[PDB]
């Protein structure tokens, strides 16, 4: 008889894995990936954090160390340390002990115990009709999370406007005064994912103006924080300016980007409440949660985030390597930006260096897009968003003629 799988199809290729694939095949050797998913160097390659490499040193010749079972809500360390990243070492919350952490499977985990967590607890009990706005665009992983988690009704806010190249703040602002109050709203604390433009902190006054006067549940993404600017505190504005205002709200934190630990899924949801007493019961909540879905957590690429936050001098020097990434990107935009000025590009370009962290939506259309793919194999997605670290001091002319070209022939 037949294989009880004879039938299976092959599943379609996605679009982030494809585009990498026809890059690996592609002879062509002006070839330049700017789909790479994570950090690259100037010459290409991986980077390995120092801080991470000696930390992991410590942690195997830590013989104290056994591999029991972490509590179900994750290593304490990890958790407290991850926390206090965000909010700073003062923050009145940490002080007042209204502040929980639980570990979780990245950042996307993070997002994904929240979720459960609010279709079951908040806003009524077993509520799966209160809206979730989500940046338009944004990152896949948002809505899908959301979506599985059993929320009904997922909705838009305006955000990118491609003509302007930039923040549709009204709409933003004008989406947000038109959500039922309660309504949830997911947050990109900095480094939009895709666009890389992001609110300036009198426009985070705006934002929040409204949630507070429409008790909108903020949920932060923090993917990116410290490796975005360079600068920890910068970083986390938006956050602690929520703090200080009074809100309530969510925080998912993912370290992959900031330690360079893409394969060790190492994230952490940060609750933030107006009382301590609530807080504890949350995180009851929040462990049978983990517990009745995922159930871990790992424990190394927690080990070695709380190994270095907790420690001064590691924290310091890891502030160091990761705002080497940042600077590097900070640099990169400036030298792209000045090269298609120079060049007499078409358009205006300044989105390039007002936008912040590892992607850029270039404001190119698809049709040029398919240019650079096809005539001059650089490879990045057909909504115009590039790793900015995949620029190098070595192809930054390339890309750049490659770019004035596209903008010059096509439209």
Known sequence: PPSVFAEVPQAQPVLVFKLTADFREDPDPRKVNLGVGAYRTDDCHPWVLPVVKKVEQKIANDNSLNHEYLPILGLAEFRSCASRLALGDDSPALKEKRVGGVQSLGGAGALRIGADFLARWYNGTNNKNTPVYVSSPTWENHNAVFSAAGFKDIRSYRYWDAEKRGLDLQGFLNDLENAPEFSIVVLHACAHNPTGID???????????????????????????????GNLERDAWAIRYFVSEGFEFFCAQAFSKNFGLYNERVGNLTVVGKEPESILQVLSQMEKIVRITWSNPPAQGA?????????????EEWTGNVKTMADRILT??????????????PGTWIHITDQIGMFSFTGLNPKQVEYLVNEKHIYLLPSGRIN????????????????HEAVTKIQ
């Open 332 to 345: 990169m935009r400036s030298e792209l930006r000045a090269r298609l000025e120079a060049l007499k590009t």
């Open 303 to 315: 080990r070695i985030v709380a190994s270095t936050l907790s420690n001064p001098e590691l924290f």
């Open 388 to 403: 900015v670290s995949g620029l190098t001091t070595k192809n930054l002319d390339y890309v750049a003629t490659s770019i």
């Open 199 to 229: 609110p300036t902190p009198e426009q985070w006054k705006q934002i929040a103006s409204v949630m507070k006067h429409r008790f909108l549940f903020p949920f932060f993404d923090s993917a990116y924080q410290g490796f975005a600017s």
